[model samples]
Target: QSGKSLSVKKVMCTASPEGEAVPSLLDGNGIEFQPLDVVNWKDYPYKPEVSFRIAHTGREILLHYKVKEASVRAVASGDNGRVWEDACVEFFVSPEGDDRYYNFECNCAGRLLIQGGAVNERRPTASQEVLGMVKRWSSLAGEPFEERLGECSWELVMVIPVSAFFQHSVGSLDGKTMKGNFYKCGDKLQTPHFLSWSPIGLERPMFHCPAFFGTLSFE
Candidate 1:
């Protein structure tokens, strides 16, 4: 497996009141893709319920995800009355493992947020990148207001080509196996909601922290 080839498997350990299926995975190559599940929610964390498999073929990577929609609603605080209402999921990537400098993220609402620490050059705020990315994808209408539904559940599937990130070198994951984190924010809430596959002591947001990221390798 040479010249930009990689594969990833994901299992989302979700909370009780599960929400929609708009699930996303931040790959080791600093790429974000949707997953395909296998088993049902009834056999969660214990069983390989939701499974995702990715195989890098040529310039494009194949992605498949499966999700179980058990009656659940994502909770939030706002007017819309749902968790995803105006909510954004950011996916960040970087070649360097420990360095916070070179990293980028894409949001569900269509935004490409950039973060350049002191060593690197900071780009734009996470919100701005999200809006711009969404525009390029489509001229869809903007969702206003906050939503906080009691419970909801859904599934998602997506695939992204390697050409998308031309700036960075792509190939056998190696050091490219970047780290990632997840975040959710409410328009009205004073503090946003945050959770990570790997917790960093509830202080900083370091995506490249290997200890906090899941394994993403090439198969």
Candidate 2:
């Protein structure tokens, strides 16, 4: 069930996303995201080139992504309304007990979709108030990066507070380890593809499977 190991280090949770602390904590940001895994894989085509930096301040999670692709699309902007169908990036995380987890999905235009529930229970779409907790910063200025014929480079930065977990009050992440997966997908885009940081091996495409996720340790 465990696929990869990611040591999540501590950083200052501030309004500033352009800091030097985050990249250093995440083992250097501005990295190039390869395909999900080997030729299930790259240099070939399809998957967008994405690099990210992730950190936590014991109270919130800060993530910044820079993406480069041939064509991009973001038609859906409303919360919980097929945002995954647009060019999107995702994060699914579970705290210590691991009975339940939250799925956070953000489209290219900065519109978000969030679902909170365990794999065993009925998952509920987040309410408007709950959805508002995620603060988004996009290089595309939250505007839909429309389909282009050539290459495109875009970025999205997000600050996720522990309160957003809704299911629980995540106090301090110090010395705790969690399970999660990072993903990039375009369900309905010019050239659709599904890429995950922790490889998801299924007959077809499905991102909700938490059993295939990797690890994140707060240090």
Candidate 3:
């Protein structure tokens, strides 16, 4: 397939016209589009139900994720760390025509890891200013996930600003078609799975391929 596409609705503050406090929930109040699901198990063995919703305003974009997970485990919590070893949700997005992209990986404990650079090329970690723009919340409390087997339902909310794009910091998000992919994985969990919104093809699991990103058009 060429690529999948989603129409990201322009979110407006219901209370006040100039409100910046956008709703972080994806309950169709702030977001008006269908949720994107991690339904593909093509990249890995284990499959845990996962889905996400998105809404964008003039300066920031909000994402809410729901994961009907199993064997939840998270130890890492911070920026630029390997949170993938824990039950994690991710968002990788690139500017319209920029060669680089940003990878936002958040573990269930509200810990986040963000990195960006040239496609398939190594780049430095995100700056504190850039990282601070990301506002996040996780349903699961204090980490070091129990080593027992159990079904877990988790929710995450992330707000990313246009300024977060260090390389291509734009003034507005009114008309831009970004390329991106949503993913869920647990590299060290009991049942590890590498899933993607836009299907990825490779001998082994990898998430750095920009060519596989779907279209995300901001309205």
Candidate 4:
């Protein structure tokens, strides 16, 4: 019943009090995401050291993060502002590995939207099914998880079961990792700070471009 064990890689990124950067994860097949978290923020001449890790067992994927100095805040939102700072996560998958596919995202603020298919431009689709699934998964706070934003460092742990991505199919799960990017957004400002498991240059938000997505190889 247990699946294979997947090796995980850690990606680190430093940020100022109000700076933005996209951290990328490039697996062999395609790019998948591990986890994204803010560590610490140093003063003018100081820089905060933030790090996030991505790991997976044959049955699940886990994300771990830590913030060093300041109380890190993670918000998941998709609105223009009115309802900023919504707890949410973004999910993207491409069966063809052609850098084009579907986008599924949901937030604690009650917003679930899916878009992008073969011929359909980017439009909103029904998200009730996926939204319910994500919500349920988010509720299960088992092991291999941590999220603490303290005076020294902030840490967060996430355990994503294989069922979250692959329903019941079983086979050579080698290159079946999900590919996409993620961002941790917090309100209190005009533009929310952006961070990605994959970086797509200096011209886009964390979710705007999918070309820089990383991979999630289940163990």
Best by TM-score: 3
**Model 3 TM-score relative to the real fold:** 0.87
lDDT of each: 0.33, 0.73, 0.76, 0.38
- Please, what are the lDDT tens digits per residue for candidate 3 over residues 48-135? 7777888777688888778886788778756667789988999999875778888999888777888889865787788888777788
Worst 10 residues of 2 by lDDT: 31-40
- Candidate 4: where is the Cα deviation over 4 Å? 1-50, 57-59, 65-84, 87-120, 123-126, 135-178, 187-191, 202-206, 215-219
Best by lDDT: 3
For candidate 3, give the lDDT of residue 157: 73
TM-score of each: 0.43, 0.84, 0.87, 0.46
Residue-level lDDT of model 1, residues 24-85, one tens digit each, is 32343344543322111221222212333343434333333332222222233321123332
Whole-model lDDT for model 3 versus the true structure?
0.76
Please report, as a residue range, the 10-residue window in candidate 4 with the lowest summed lDDT.
Answer: 15-24
lDDT assessment of candidate 1: 0.33
lDDT for each residue of candidate 2 in 98-177, tens digit (9 for 90 to 100):
67888988887888899988777889998888887777766555555555557878777677877888888778777888
- Counting clashing residue pairs in each candidate, in order, gives 28, 0, 0, 29
Clashing pairs in 2: none
Error of 4 at 102 (Å): 5.0
Local accuracy of candidate 4 as per-residue lDDT tens digits, 113-206: 4555533354345344533343222221223212234444333333433343322243333346555554444333232344444444534333
Error of 3 at 106 (Å): 0.4
